[PDB]
Ligand binder design. Structure first.
Ligand SMILES: CC[C@H](NC(=O)[C@H](CC(C)C)NC(=O)OCc1ccccc1)[C@H](O)C(=O)NCCCn1cnc2c(N)ncnc21
Ligand SMILES: [Ca+2]
Ligand SMILES: [Ca+2]
Ligand SMILES: [Cl-]
Ligand SMILES: [Cl-]
Ligand SMILES: [Cl-]
Length: 322
């Protein structure tokens, strides 16, 4: 059983809030500017001034903790430098077992709701249960930071809040390492690969890792400063964490081609090269493969050939667990 971060006891706090007829407000991570940040999100910053803390039950008549499953399309980045974290959460959703260790079952805005939620993380060398109240940063009625493509779904916003809490503020999340989030969700072992020196069996390594439910992420180093822009000519984002979400082989004019699928945690802005959603390559595979694999949607998720992947990307991170 997870031990309680700061000694805060989820079920006890929830039960006592319900008894006392109030909603939880978290003394350890309160709905004030110091929970937002210290510089870019500090008390006197332009960003801080626009933000009002509001509960999902203040925003909507029918807020939901999870809608149609806790899945990667529920991870759409907001105005914060936490792409590394969000890439990790998106990858986490592909492994139901680990997902629901981090996101406990049984949390809702209906029966038993008292304005408090909890998540479990690997921290300080322990599995720790972290509570949050459900006051969330909003501007004009919309979440400022992470949000789901399902506008009434709140689990991922609440998990990002819990992760900010253990790190001190949302601003403390700006700029980071995907592998650190992977570890914090698993207590597993992380390794990384230099794609410009890829082992010859790297694609099989990826296949095996995906099959076992390991977490995979990738990025493109900014080698100059951000000279050729943050965005490459083919619509990739440099210095930015992507989730690796599948690896599948297709038959392209009668020959096997290894593909890899990844997802930009923005939930938008995708590769426009071969195998992209609108590319001509799809016209020359088996119709069944096309139907199974290709999804024509601006959703941040796309395929690349493994060959193009290892040319365009520079780093692959893998977190292996038990
Ligand atoms: C810094 C950028 C973030 N990148 C990083 O963290 C990188 C991640 C690695 C895997 C390359 N790491 C990093 O730099 O190390 C900094 C480091 C390491 C250790 C200690 C302190 C600082 C990330 O790209 C990000 O969060 N971008 C969000 C951009 C705003 N935005 C949000 N929605 C957007 C949208 N729809 N469209 C356009 N922009 C959007
Ligand atoms: Ca969902
Ligand atoms: Ca897509
Ligand atoms: Cl408390
Ligand atoms: Cl303030
Ligand atoms: Cl609910």
């Amino acid at each position: 059983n997870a031990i309680k971060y700061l000694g805060q006891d989820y079920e006890n706090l929830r039960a006592r809030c319900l008894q006392n007829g109030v909603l939880f407000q978290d003394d350890a991570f309160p709905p004030v500017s110091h929970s937002l940040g210290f510089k870019e999100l500090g008390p006197n910053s332009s960003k801080t001034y626009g933000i009002k803390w509001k509960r999902p039950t203040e925003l909507l008549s029918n807020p939901q903790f999870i809608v149609d499953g806790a899945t990667r399309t529920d991870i759409c980045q907001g105005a914060l430098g936490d792409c590394w974290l969000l890439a990790a959460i998106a990858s986490l959703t592909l492994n139901e077992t680990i997902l629901h260790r981090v996101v406990p079952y049984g949390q809702s805005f209906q029966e038993g709701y008292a304005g408090i939620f909890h998540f479990q993380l690997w921290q300080f060398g322990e599995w720790v249960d972290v509570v949050v109240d459900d006051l969330l940063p909003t501007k004009d009625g919309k979440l400022v930071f992470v949000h789901s493509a399902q506008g009434n779904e709140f689990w991922s916003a609440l998990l990002e809040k819990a992760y900010a809490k253990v790190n001190g503020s949302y601003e403390a999340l700006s700029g980071g390492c995907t592998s650190e989030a992977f570890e914090d969700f698993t207590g597993g072992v992380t390794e990384w690969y230099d794609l410009q020196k890829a082992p010859s069996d790297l694609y099989q390594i990826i296949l095996k890792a995906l099959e076992r439910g390991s977490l995979l992420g990738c990025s493109i180093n900014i080698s100059d400063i951000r000279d050729l822009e943050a965005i490459t000519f083919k619509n990739l984002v440099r210095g930015h964490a992507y989730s690796v979400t599948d690896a599948k082989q297709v038959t392209y004019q009668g020959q096997r081609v290894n593909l890899i699928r990844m997802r930009n945690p923005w939930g938008e802005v995708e590769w426009k090269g071969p195998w992209s959603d609108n590319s001509y390559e799809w016209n020359k595979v088996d119709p069944y493969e096309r139907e199974q694999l290709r999804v024509k949607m601006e959703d941040g998720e796309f395929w690349m050939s493994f060959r193009d992947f290892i040319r365009e990307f520079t780093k692959l991170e893998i977190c292996n667990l038990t």
